[PDB]
């Protein structure tokens, strides 16, 4: 599809925000899980239990 001088095209919709949301949690969920490990073996002092 050709473009005419003076015409622009763009995309949008719900999908866009998702591309961020997932990414964001895909960046934090790991760290949170780590916050568990460090806080889990404080009662056992060994990694096997956590």
């Amino acid at each position: 599809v050709q473009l005419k001088p003076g015409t622009s095209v763009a995309f949008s919709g719900q999908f866009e925000l998702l591309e961020r949301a997932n990414h964001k949690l895909k960046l934090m969920v790991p760290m949170t899980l780590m916050i568990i490990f460090v806080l889990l073996y404080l009662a056992f002092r060994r990694v096997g239990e956590a």
Binding site: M31, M34, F37, V38, Y41
Partner: protein
């Protein structure tokens, strides 16, 4: 005064890793410029 700090080396390592990741993140996302507003 830091004897209790060396007895839990693993906590120190985990904290250092968290700090390094957070710092890399904030550095990747910090705004950079030159000669800021000074007038």
């Amino acid at each position: 005064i830091i004897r209790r700090s060396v007895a839990n080396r693993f906590l120190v390592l985990m904290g250092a890793l968290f700090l390094s990741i957070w710092g890399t993140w904030t550095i990747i996302n910090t705004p950079v410029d030159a000669l800021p507003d000074l007038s």
